Amino acid sequence: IIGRAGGIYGDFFNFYACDLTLKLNVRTVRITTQPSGRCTPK
Amino acid sequence: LEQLRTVSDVLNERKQDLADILTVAGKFITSLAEALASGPYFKVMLVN
Amino acid sequence: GLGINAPPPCLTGFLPASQWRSPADTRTEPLPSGLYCKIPKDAPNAVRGARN
Amino acid sequence: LVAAVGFGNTGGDIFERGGPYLVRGAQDLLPTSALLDEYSPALFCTIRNYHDAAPKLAGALGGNGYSLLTNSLVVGVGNPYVYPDNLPRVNAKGGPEGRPGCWQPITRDLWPFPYLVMDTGASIAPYNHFELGQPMFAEYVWGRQVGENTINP
Amino acid sequence: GRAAPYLVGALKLILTVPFNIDNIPKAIRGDYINVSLKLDLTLSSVDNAFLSGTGVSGMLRALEQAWGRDPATMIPDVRFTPNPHDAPGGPLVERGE
Amino acid sequence: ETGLHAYPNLAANVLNINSPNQGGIIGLPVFNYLPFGMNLASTAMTLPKQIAYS
Questions:
Q1: Separation of first and last alpha carbons in chain A
Q2: Discontinuities after residues in chain F (C–N over 2.5 A)
Q3: Closest Cα to residue E33, out of D102, A18, C18?
Q4: What is the C-alpha to C-alpha distance for residues D120 and D127, in angstroms, rounded to an integer?
Q5: Using CB atoms within 10 A of its CB, is residue E80 exposed (0-12), middle (13-18) or buried (19+)?
Q6: What are phi and psi of F52, to 5 degrees?
Q7: Which of B30, B41, B43, B48 to mutate to test the interface with C (most CBs of C within 10 A)?
Q8: Nearest C-alpha of chain F: how many angstroms from C39?
Q9: DSSP readout, D6-27?
Q10: For residues C5 and D141, is the Cβ–Cβ distance under 8 A?
């Protein structure tokens, strides 16, 4: 799995950010979350 | 010798798994180490 | 790190750009062999790659 | 006498087949044995530290069960490696303070790990200041970029 | 023999140093590693990332420290927290002999 | 054979990835790509006190 994760499409790792949020002052603001799809508890 | 016997038995039952580990780990280490070669960092493809 | 396209990625010697798989599919496929940065072995890009 | 005949034949066959193998193996094991002995002190501490960090690095990527937890802050990056000077080397030897070992475990009380520069041709030792990138602007049409590549920023 | 009790637990990480084998099948769903991005723009992160190593290393570190934030939850101030190299009592190294 | 050949360089490179002052690992994001690229400045990854020689 880690062999086919990154380094096959080029000179880079493959990251898939399902949920990105901003932390700033100290509240953490949530921008994007994915409920269902490739990122579901399993 | 007896504890070496049980260790070697659990190893011999999983000798195919050791061979698979070596096979599938020797064919991607260069490809994985390629990404973190350009500089003091590692490239990432943030799809989102 | 800050700075976009300061080192560019070498797609020479890796999977074809049309062979990239959609993220909607979680099925794992066998990993191909013999893929690394196949640049002419000079320049600042990927100095510490496999070819060296 | 009959048992001696049989045992001598069998043992002689086994020894003739597996004697030179053992001799050359024990001859070739001298450098590996010396290397393992030389870097023995960094064995127990390495395994202890990896055992300690395994639950943390497991809960980091297994805590959500569907993702990985990371703290993302933007920073500046150093100059890419030059061709001749920064070539890979496999001449790494020794350990911290000149001899092999481990640092004491890194809690939050002593957080910055001392950077260990090894004979590899690549380092980030002289990044002690904020300086503009030597290849500040680069063009990928005719391969001409602003600034001069260097190993001493 | 000293490290024999911890070796079975270290094998979870000592081969793949940044990856833990237990949760790989669910973190990485094929060709893309999953990740959750926490883009922190707190003055501690800004001070450590950018203004480190210069003469304004304390320009806004004390600005956050004087506010309601606590040093425990902040990333350590690299100019004051001791490191195993120059810590008092000499270098802090453990050697197995 | 390939593991023994290619692991020391991976180890050295990942060691050089880590920034002692900022902590963690630095990963920069990435027709094939844009013709122009920029690298504004490099931050102080280490300090003179934090350097120990192997």
A1: 16
A2: 30
A3: A18
A4: 17
A5: exposed
A6: -120, 135
A7: B30
A8: 15
A9: HHHHHHHHHHHHHHHHHHHHHH
A10: no
DSSP H/E element including B9: helix B2-13
Judge: D67–A19 Cβ closer than 8 Å, yes or no.
yes
Experimentally, how was this structure solved?
Answer: cryo-EM
Please say whether the beta carbons of A14 and E33 come within 8 A: yes
Which residue of E19, E23, E44, E78 to mutate against D (max D Cβ within 10 Å)? E23
Does D124 contact F at CB distance below 8 Å?
yes
Contact D96, E67 (CB under 8 A): no
Rounded CA separation D126/D153 (Å): 7
Nearest chain E residue to D57, by CA: E20
What's the length of chain C? 52
Q: Of E49, A6, D76, whose CA–CA distance to B47 is shortest?
A: A6
Please tell me what resolution, in angstroms, this structure has.
2.8
